[PDB]
Enzyme design. Structure first.
Site, PDB file in Angstrom:
ATOM      1  NE  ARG A  23      -0.949 -59.281 -15.686  1.00 43.08           N
ATOM      2  CZ  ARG A  23       0.326 -58.323 -15.641  1.00 43.08           C
ATOM      3  NH1 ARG A  23      -0.221 -56.751 -15.951  1.00 43.08           N
ATOM      4  NH2 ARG A  23       1.785 -58.808 -15.526  1.00 43.08           N
ATOM      5  CD  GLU A  60       3.367 -43.481 -24.170  1.00 41.70           C
ATOM      6  OE1 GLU A  60       3.750 -43.569 -24.842  1.00 41.70           O
ATOM      7  OE2 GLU A  60       3.351 -43.666 -23.008  1.00 41.70           O
ATOM      8  CD1 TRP A  82       0.886 -42.878 -20.385  1.00 40.18           C
ATOM      9  CD2 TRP A  82       1.304 -43.769 -18.849  1.00 40.18           C
ATOM     10  NE1 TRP A  82       1.978 -43.144 -20.835  1.00 40.18           N
ATOM     11  CE2 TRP A  82       2.091 -44.114 -19.917  1.00 40.18           C
ATOM     12  CE3 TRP A  82       2.077 -44.862 -17.714  1.00 40.18           C
ATOM     13  CZ2 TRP A  82       3.290 -45.458 -19.760  1.00 40.18           C
ATOM     14  CZ3 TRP A  82       2.284 -46.032 -17.411  1.00 40.18           C
ATOM     15  CH2 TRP A  82       2.987 -45.786 -18.580  1.00 40.18           C
ATOM     16  CE1 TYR A 146       8.856 -49.055 -19.903  1.00 43.01           C
ATOM     17  CE2 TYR A 146       6.662 -47.992 -19.656  1.00 43.01           C
ATOM     18  CZ  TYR A 146       6.906 -48.889 -20.078  1.00 43.01           C
ATOM     19  OH  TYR A 146       6.830 -50.219 -20.288  1.00 43.01           O
ATOM     20  CB  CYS A 198       5.369 -53.574 -21.434  1.00 45.16           C
ATOM     21  SG  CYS A 198       3.496 -54.167 -20.811  1.00 45.16           S
ATOM     22  NE  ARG A 218       6.385 -56.751 -18.238  1.00 42.73           N
ATOM     23  CZ  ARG A 218       5.779 -57.624 -17.940  1.00 42.73           C
ATOM     24  NH1 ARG A 218       5.769 -58.850 -17.792  1.00 42.73           N
ATOM     25  NH2 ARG A 218       4.193 -56.307 -18.025  1.00 42.73           N
ATOM     26  CB  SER A 219       4.304 -59.105 -22.093  1.00 42.84           C
ATOM     27  OG  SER A 219       3.018 -59.480 -22.839  1.00 42.84           O
ATOM     28  CG  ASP A 221      -2.892 -55.238 -26.920  1.00 45.21           C
ATOM     29  OD1 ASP A 221      -2.871 -55.471 -28.298  1.00 45.21           O
ATOM     30  OD2 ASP A 221      -3.894 -55.408 -26.447  1.00 45.21           O
ATOM     31  CG  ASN A 229       4.917 -51.225 -28.085  1.00 46.62           C
ATOM     32  OD1 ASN A 229       4.133 -52.512 -27.570  1.00 46.62           O
ATOM     33  ND2 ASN A 229       4.093 -49.432 -27.151  1.00 46.62           N
ATOM     34  CG  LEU A 260      -4.278 -60.947 -32.069  1.00 44.92           C
ATOM     35  CD1 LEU A 260      -3.931 -62.443 -33.245  1.00 44.92           C
ATOM     36  CD2 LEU A 260      -5.579 -61.023 -32.564  1.00 44.92           C
TER      37      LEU A 260
HETATM   38  O1  LIG Z   1       2.257 -50.205 -25.134  1.00 40.92           O
HETATM   39  C1  LIG Z   1       1.847 -50.754 -24.699  1.00 40.92           C
HETATM   40  C2  LIG Z   1       0.839 -50.974 -23.490  1.00 40.92           C
HETATM   41  C3  LIG Z   1       0.429 -52.271 -23.392  1.00 40.92           C
HETATM   42  N1  LIG Z   1       0.432 -53.055 -23.758  1.00 40.92           N
HETATM   43  C4  LIG Z   1       0.457 -54.724 -23.529  1.00 40.92           C
HETATM   44  C5  LIG Z   1       0.640 -55.905 -22.691  1.00 40.92           C
HETATM   45  C6  LIG Z   1      -0.288 -56.583 -22.286  1.00 40.92           C
HETATM   46  O2  LIG Z   1      -0.433 -57.088 -23.289  1.00 40.92           O
HETATM   47  C7  LIG Z   1      -0.779 -56.008 -21.660  1.00 40.92           C
HETATM   48  C8  LIG Z   1       0.036 -56.186 -20.008  1.00 40.92           C
HETATM   49  O3  LIG Z   1      -0.174 -57.248 -19.430  1.00 40.92           O
HETATM   50  P1  LIG Z   1       0.775 -57.941 -19.384  1.00 40.92           P
HETATM   51  O4  LIG Z   1       0.553 -59.367 -20.532  1.00 40.92           O
HETATM   52  O5  LIG Z   1       2.039 -57.726 -19.141  1.00 40.92           O
HETATM   53  O6  LIG Z   1       1.080 -58.809 -18.032  1.00 40.92           O
HETATM   54  O7  LIG Z   1      -0.480 -54.776 -21.915  1.00 40.92           O
HETATM   55  C9  LIG Z   1       1.633 -53.564 -25.420  1.00 40.92           C
HETATM   56  O8  LIG Z   1       2.398 -54.882 -25.336  1.00 40.92           O
HETATM   57  N2  LIG Z   1       2.090 -52.253 -25.420  1.00 40.92           N
END
Ligand SMILES: O=c1ccn([C@H]2C[C@H](O)[C@@H](COP(=O)(O)O)O2)c(=O)[nH]1
Ligand SMILES: O=c1ccn([C@H]2C[C@H](O)[C@@H](COP(=O)(O)O)O2)c(=O)[nH]1
Ligand SMILES: [K+]
Ligand SMILES: [K+]
Lengths: 316, 316
Positions: A23, A60, A82, A146, A198, A218-219, A221, A229, A260
Site C-alpha cells: 500500500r 501500550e 498511536w 484493540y 494486524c 495477517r501481516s 514488518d 509484536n 521486509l
Molecule cells: O506492530 C506492528 C505494526 C505494524 N505492522 C505493519 C504490517 C504492515 O507492514 C503495515 C500495515 O499494512 P499491511 O501490510 O498490513 O496491509 O504495518 C506490523 O507488522 N507490526
C-alpha cells in the site's frame, strides 16, 4: 539463543522472499506462512541484538487491558505509537483551521519544512487531548482499536462482550478447552477501517499446568514491527498466566504476510552480524493479581543488556 | 464531561479522606460533607468510565414507585439487589431446617465451600418466594424498605400517607413551594432496623419551568454505591418531571459520610486513568404519563457506550 527464530526469519526473507508490492509503494520482500515458537521458561524474548523500548510496549499493552481506546492515557505515559491515527481525524475535521496537512506522512518525510509545521500541529494536538477534556473525548478516542475489540465487542442485540474477561475465566474453570480464543477481526467493520487488525486472533492452551499462547498475524514488518509484536504477546502470556496462577509455557507466533520493506535491507543485515546475548527476565508483582488493574510498576524487566539501537525509516 | 463531579469525589477522598472505621471493619477513607450538581439537560449521568447496569436501577426504582415491598417483583425481573435482607429472615426463621447460615456474608467470602451451600439455599429461597404465594408473603416481604416509606408512611392515628403521591400534586398546584420534601427517616423505626435509610430525605424545586431535585445521603460507598445512587435519583427527577409536564433541571447530590472501602483503592485508581466519553440520553414514553403505572419498556437508555466493567469485593 532465545531470539534465534526472529534472526532466522530475517535470513529466510532475505533468502527466499519474492518482491511484492504494498500500500505504501515502498517495496517489500514477502513470504506467506511461517511459525516460530518461544519457550518463555528460558527467558523473555526481547531482542538483544537491538535495543527495544520495553516501556512503550508495557504501557501500550496495559492501555489494551484497560479496554481503553483514548490516546490521552498513552500521552500520559509519553507513548506516541498511536498519535498519527487520531491526528488524521483532527486534520480532516471541519473545526480544523490551520495549514493543509493532506498526506502528511510522505510530505513530512521528503519536505524538511513540512516536517516542522507538521510537528507543531501535532505537538499542540497532543496538548489539547491532554488538557481539554472535551477535545480528548472528541478526537483522542480512536474507537475501534484493540482495547475495545478485546473488551467491548459490540453485539447485533445492542450490548457489549468482554472476550478477554470471559476467556480468562474459562481458563480457570475449563483449562483444557480448545476454544480459548479472542478475535479482533470483525467483518462488518474491517472494510470501513483504515488499518484492519494486524493481530487477527489469538488462542490460549493449557497442559501440565503451563499456559501457552498462539498469535495469528495477517501481516508483519520484520524490522520495525516484529520486535514489538513478540514482546507484547509474550508479556500477555505472562500476565494472563499470573492471574490464572499457572506456569509460563510457549509463545507460538504464526504469520500470514511476513514482509521486509526494501529500505531496511542494510539495517537488517547489520543486525545479523550481531551475536545475541543472554535474554532478560520478567518480574511481576507477586501480591497484586488482577492484571486488569496492573500498572507500570507492577511489571519489571531485569538484566536487559541490548546492543545499541538501529535507526531506520518508516514506510509511509 | 458530565460525570466529572464523581471522578473529582474519588480523587478528593483519595487525597484528603482520613482513615475511619466502619461496621464491617473493612476500613474506609472518609470525608464528611460534600455536594455535586448534575445538569440533566446535558445528558443522563450514567458513568461511562465503568459499565453500570441500567436495568437493575430502573426495575428497582419502579419497584419503589409501585410502593411495593416484596422481593418477588425484583426476582421477576432478575434483580437480586435486595435478596440478602430477605434471606436473612428465612434463615433465622424456626421453619428453617437446613445448614447453619450464621453470618453468611463473611463466611461465604472466605470459605469457598460455604459459598456453594450458601448459593444453594439462596437459589431455592428465591424459588419459593417466586412460586409459593404464601412463602412470598411471609419472607419476600421486607416491610420497611423505601417503597412503603415513600408511599405508605404509617401514622400514629393508624392509617397511611402517600408522601410522593401528595408531593407530586403540590408540584402541579404549588410549584413554588419550598416544602416539596419526602423523608425515609422515621425515628421510631430507625433503631430497630438493620440498615436505616442511606437516602434520608430529598427535595424538589421548581423555577423557570424546570424541575430540580436534591438528595441528602447520610452515608455513601464511592465505588460500588454512588454510581447506582446517581442514576436512580436523576431518573426519578425525569419521571416526576414527566408527570408534571416540566423541563428537566439539575440533580444536586449532597453527602454526609462519603467513604471508600480500602479494598477498592486499586479499582478506583484504574477508573481515574479512564477518560469519560459523551453521556447517554434518556427516552420516556410520550403517551403514557402516570409514572406510577410505568413499566420497563416505558423508560429507555440511548447511546450508552461505557468502558468495560470493573469488578471489586463487597465490604461485608
Ligand atoms: O506492530 C506492528 C505494526 C505494524 N505492522 C505493519 C504490517 C504492515 O507492514 C503495515 C500495515 O499494512 P499491511 O501490510 O498490513 O496491509 O504495518 C506490523 O507488522 N507490526
Ligand atoms: O446504594 C447504596 C447502597 C449502599 N451504600 C452503602 C453505604 C455504606 O457503605 C453501607 C451501609 O452502612 P453505613 O456505612 O451507612 O452505616 O452501604 C451506598 O452508599 N449506596
Ligand atoms: K472474527
Ligand atoms: K423524618
Amino acid at each position: 539463543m532465545l531470539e534465534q527464530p526472529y534472526l532466522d526469519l530475517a535470513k529466510k526473507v532475505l533468502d527466499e522472499g519474492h518482491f511484492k508490492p504494498d500500500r505504501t509503494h515502498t517495496g517489500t520482500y514477502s513470504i506467506f506462512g511461517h511459525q516460530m515458537r518461544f519457550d518463555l521458561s528460558k527467558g523473555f524474548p526481547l531482542l538483544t541484538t537491538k535495543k527495544v523500548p520495553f516501556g512503550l510496549i508495557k504501557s501500550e499493552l496495559l492501555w489494551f487491558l484497560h479496554g481503553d481506546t483514548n490516546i490521552r492515557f498513552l500521552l500520559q505515559h509519553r507513548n506516541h505509537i498511536w498519535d498519527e491515527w487520531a491526528f488524521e481525524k483532527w486534520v480532516k475535521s471541519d473545526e480544523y483551521h490551520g495549514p493543509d496537512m493532506t498526506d502528511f506522512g510522505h510530505r513530512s518525510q521528503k519536505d524538511p519544512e513540512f516536517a516542522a509545521v507538521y510537528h507543531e500541529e501535532m505537538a499542540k494536538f497532543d496538548d489539547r487531548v491532554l488538557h481539554d477534556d472535551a477535545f480528548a473525548a472528541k478526537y483522542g478516542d480512536l474507537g475501534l482499536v484493540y482495547g475495545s475489540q478485546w473488551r467491548a465487542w459490540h453485539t447485533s442485540k445492542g450490548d457489549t462482550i468482554d472476550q478477554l474477561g470471559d476467556v480468562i475465566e474459562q481458563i480457570k474453570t475449563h483449562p483444557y478447552s480448545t476454544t480459548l480464543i479472542v478475535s479482533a477481526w470483525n467483518p462488518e467493520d474491517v472494510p470501513t477501517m483504515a488499518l484492519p487488525p494486524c493481530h487477527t486472533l489469538y488462542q490460549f492452551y493449557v497442559n501440565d499446568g503451563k499456559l501457552s499462547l498462539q498469535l495469528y498475524q495477517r501481516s508483519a514488518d520484520i524490522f520495525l514491527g516484529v520486535p514489538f509484536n513478540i514482546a507484547s504477546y509474550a508479556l500477555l502470556t505472562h500476565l494472563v498466566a499470573h492471574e490464572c496462577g499457572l506456569e509460563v509455557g510457549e509463545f507460538i507466533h504464526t504469520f500470514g504476510d511476513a514482509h521486509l520493506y526494501v529500505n531496511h535491507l542494510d539495517q537488517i543485515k547489520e543486525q545479523l552480524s550481531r551475536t545475541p546475548r543472554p535474554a532478560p527476565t520478567l518480574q511481576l508483582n507477586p501480591d497484586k493479581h488482577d492484571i486488569f488493574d496492573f500498572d507500570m510498576k507492577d511489571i519489571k524487566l531485569l538484566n536487559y543488556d541490548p546492543y545499541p539501537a538501529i535507526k531506520a525509516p518508516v514506510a509511509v
